[PDB]
Amino acid sequence: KLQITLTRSVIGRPETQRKTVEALGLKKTNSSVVVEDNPAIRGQINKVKHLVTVEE
Amino acid sequence: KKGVSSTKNGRDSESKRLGAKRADGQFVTGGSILYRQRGTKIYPGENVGRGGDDTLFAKIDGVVKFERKGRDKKQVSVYAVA
Amino acid sequence: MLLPKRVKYRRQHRPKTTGRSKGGNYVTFGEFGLQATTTSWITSRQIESARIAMTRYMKRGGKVWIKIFPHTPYTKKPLEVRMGAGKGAVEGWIAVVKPGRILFEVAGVSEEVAREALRLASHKLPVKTKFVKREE
Amino acid sequence: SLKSIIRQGKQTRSDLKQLRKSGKVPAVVYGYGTKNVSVKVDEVEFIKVIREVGRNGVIELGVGSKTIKVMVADYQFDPLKNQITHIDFLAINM
RNA sequence: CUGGUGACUAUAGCAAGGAGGUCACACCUGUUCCCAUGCCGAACACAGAAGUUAAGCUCCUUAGCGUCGAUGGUAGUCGAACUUACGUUCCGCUAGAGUAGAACGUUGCCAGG
RNA sequence: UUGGCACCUCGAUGUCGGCUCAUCGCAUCCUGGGGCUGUAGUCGGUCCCAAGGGUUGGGCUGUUCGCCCAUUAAAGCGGUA
RNA sequence: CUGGGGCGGUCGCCUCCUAAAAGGUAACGGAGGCGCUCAAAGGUUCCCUCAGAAUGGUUGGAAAUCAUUCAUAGAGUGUAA
RNA sequence: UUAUUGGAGGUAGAGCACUGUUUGGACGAGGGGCCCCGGGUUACCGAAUUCAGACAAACUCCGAAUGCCAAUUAAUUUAACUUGGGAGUCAGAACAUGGGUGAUAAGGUCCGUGUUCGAAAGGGAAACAGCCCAGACCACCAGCUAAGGUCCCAAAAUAUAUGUUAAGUGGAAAAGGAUGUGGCGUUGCCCAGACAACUAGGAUGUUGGCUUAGAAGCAGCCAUCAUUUAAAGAGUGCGUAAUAGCUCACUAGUCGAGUGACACUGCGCCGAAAAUGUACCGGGGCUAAACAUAUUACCGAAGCUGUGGAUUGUCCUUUG
Ligand SMILES: [Mg+2]
Ligand SMILES: [Mg+2]
Ligand SMILES: [Mg+2]
Ligand SMILES: [Mg+2]
Ligand SMILES: [Mg+2]
Ligand SMILES: [Mg+2]
Ligand SMILES: [Mg+2]
Ligand SMILES: [Mg+2]
Ligand SMILES: [Mg+2]
Ligand SMILES: [Mg+2]
Ligand SMILES: [Mg+2]
């Protein structure tokens, strides 16, 4: 299980990255999600690594 | 205001939307256009016909596979699903 | 004045200038050569001015190899015209030089003579340069 | 005709940049009697050795514990920096 | 082993040297007939077997050429941070060329030996 | 300066020259202080500092310019719609 | 239509480059073609392989037709690419 | 959306196998100026060939990153499509980046991509649609952060550590110029006496040969040697019309410690002149209150959180 928090805003960011943040279940700034670790999840985190903070 | 000359260019034809119309590994019904091209950049393969304009089309329902045809050639084939 | 005898296209897109030199980064015909440390277009006129200067100091005892050739034609619009109504006429011929490119090579002289000759050439050219020798 | 070398792991672009700044040169060892090994050698030491042995001179390379006689098959050089970016060592059958 | 007929991106090719002939495959011997030459039995076709391994062909050796080809490094580049610098930095991807090396094929089916 | 661009102004931002009144910059025309000189002296050349003050009246042309007459230590060059 | 308008040029269609390795993508951007032609230059069946070069040979010349060898396509494919 | 897998395609880069462009080498098919149907050899060698080295939007033996199309595909997410009623829009802008055009001009112009503005308030950038941070339901004299900041204006460090700069550089610019200063290497000489200074010599053939009216070391060419050395160039310069003269290179002494060159670099210097008034840090001021590299705090928004409230969904679910 990983805890992902949206530390940085999606404003001013490319839409494709915004879609990934939505796909990860992240909502407003400073919102968090707890998700199971898997390759697909890691790839999403990789795309928006600048926008999020990850805690295991 | 200095007088000016003119260009002898300014013309182009309509683009012809050539290229792949169906993906490799995709199911297609018979008659589906697979590739649009001038000449044979891709050759007609198994269960694939070549049109008068060199359009490649499925002759049966099946899965599209783009395959090598020798060192420097390629072909497209359709195989019926089990 | 170095220029291509003929070209298929007289009006060409201007060359990309960003990046580093693709080739001719080593002295291959002479003992010493001049290496570009900055990027700029080099015109045929500039090549000739640099060439005449270096040959004079060398006194023609040494041999000069000009590595760069001005292949690309460039256009200029007639004076006092508005924008549009086609590209202008050919005005000059240029070589794109990027850092590392050896502009000229010299042989048949002492290093001291070569260093001065290349210095005299360098002052005629837009780019910054460094004196270079064959490396083994 | 002997210069010590150190083995290397998988490297990021930053690591190699730091190596060259340190003065070490990335290199590879291949040829008869050796599997390919990625190694780092000090530039100054390499330059001294090659002057002694010449360009095609045989060199004794301290590849880990083992010592392999090698030749410089090829090298990559940066003309602007006056630095050897990479060296290829070929093992010689004896 | 040989032959017919298929598969494969030339690692399969090219070149050079060598070897081989009851059968087989050719060269070859003729043009009566089927058939043939924009002229020619050269070819094609057919009827044959005196001669010959000469050539083709098949086999063997080779790395000269062609082909294949890493590892490492480099260029380039997605993203990011920094900047406006013919930029920098980090991360992932990652050539081309070249180098070591590979390579004078590997195989399916059928009929003979 | 001649242009390029078309960004404020088309329910109006009057446009050349002159006249009146100036005001500012200095890349200095004169005067002041210097260096070098192919500076003997008297004169000059060139460059540096310096903007305090000074920098004329006419002929021709709408002219700005420009040429010319006669001067002056000098008859400066630009900005201010 | 138009880097104001006029004047000049242009207007449909085809091919390429610009075009950022799917497709698409503009400027009065860079280059060219079309408004046909063919009764075979269509269909099919069978057969066939070029350009060029070297050498030898009469009229015959660098170049005509002939012969051999080399030649992987540098030929040809009605007509732009 | 991502992961995984398969595919189409020719860009960046690269390369020169093609089409063109191009540099330096060799080298010649075949005869002319040339020397015999009886042979040769100091152009052209244009054919061609070869070795090495470069160039290309409309070159390609090659060839990515990405993007694109798919998958009886998995994870996460929440859309998607069809039909019908009602629209508005068809002047776009900047910024970043891939390109054309223009001049590698334009707050220029025209296409690709992304973001913001448009239609977006709040914080930062002094002020400042388009930059940076961030999307305001309402209330609070509560808390935490973003960009950006923390000497005073003006909230928070006159913070900590180690260096750099002396230019108010910071807080506008170039070719080029310079014993500015810091760092990291390479190398020559040196207490068998380095570098500089000072003292002394600095010669002979010979005024080397040619040239010029003249050239003796010093306008221009050729060579650039022997002899006495404790050392001397057929002279580094100044100078004479030519001479002369002075001086240097080099050498031997005095004192005794370092001295010279080169490469790569950090931060500074000069180059640097415009018009109402300082006027190119927002001001004061600053030698850190600049810059570089780390560390720990704090400040900072209408972001997030806390408390109360409103409206509308959704889920439990008479309740709330
Ligand atoms: Mg087209
Ligand atoms: Mg506009
Ligand atoms: Mg009004
Ligand atoms: Mg002044
Ligand atoms: Mg495309
Ligand atoms: Mg694309
Ligand atoms: Mg390129
Ligand atoms: Mg845009
Ligand atoms: Mg305070
Ligand atoms: Mg706090
Ligand atoms: Mg809120």
UniProtKB/Swiss-Prot annotation, chain A:
The keyword ATP-binding does not apply. Keywords: Ribonucleoprotein, Ribosomal protein. One of its GO terms (biological process) is translation. Pfam families: Ribosomal_L30. The keyword Repeat does not apply. One of its GO terms (molecular function) is structural constituent of ribosome. One of its GO terms (cellular component) is cytosolic large ribosomal subunit. Part of the 50S ribosomal subunit. HAMAP family: Ribosomal_uL30_B. Belongs to the universal ribosomal protein uL30 family. This is Large ribosomal subunit protein uL30. It comes from Staphylococcus aureus (strain NCTC 8325 / PS 47). The lineage of its organism: Bacteria, Bacillati, Bacillota, Bacilli, Bacillales.
UniProtKB/Swiss-Prot annotation, chain B:
Pfam families: Ribosomal_L27. One of its GO terms (biological process) is translation. Gene3D superfamilies: 2.40.50.100. Disruption phenotype: Essential, it cannot be disrupted. GO terms for molecular function: structural constituent of ribosome. PROSITE patterns: RIBOSOMAL_L27. Keywords: Ribonucleoprotein, Ribosomal protein. The N-terminus is cleaved by ribosomal processing protease Prp. Uncleaved protein can be incorporated into pre-50S ribosome subunits. Cleavage of the N-terminus of bL27 is essential for growth; it cannot be replaced by a 'pre-cleaved' or non-cleavable form. One of its GO terms (cellular component) is cytosolic large ribosomal subunit. Part of the 50S ribosomal subunit. A mutant Prp protease unable to cleave bL27 copurifies with its substrate. PANTHER family: LARGE RIBOSOMAL SUBUNIT PROTEIN BL27M (PTHR15893:SF0), RIBOSOMAL PROTEIN L27 (PTHR15893). Belongs to the bacterial ribosomal protein bL27 family. This is Large ribosomal subunit protein bL27. The gene is rpmA.
From Swiss-Prot, chain C:
The keyword Repeat does not apply. GO terms for molecular function: rRNA binding; structural constituent of ribosome; tRNA binding. Transmembrane segments: none annotated. Residues 1-23 are annotated as: Disordered. Residues 1-19 have a biased composition (Basic residues). One of its GO terms (cellular component) is cytosolic large ribosomal subunit. CDD domains: Ribosomal_L16_L10e. GO terms for biological process: translation. Keywords: Ribonucleoprotein, Ribosomal protein, RNA-binding, rRNA-binding, tRNA-binding. InterPro entries: Ribosomal_uL16 (IPR047873), Ribosomal_uL16_bact-type (IPR000114), Ribosomal_uL16_CS (IPR020798), Ribosomal_uL16_dom (IPR016180), Ribosomal_uL16_sf (IPR036920). Pfam families: Ribosomal_L16. Belongs to the universal ribosomal protein uL16 family. Binds 23S rRNA and is also seen to make contacts with the A and possibly P site tRNAs. Part of the 50S ribosomal subunit. This is Large ribosomal subunit protein uL16. It comes from Staphylococcus aureus (strain NCTC 8325 / PS 47).
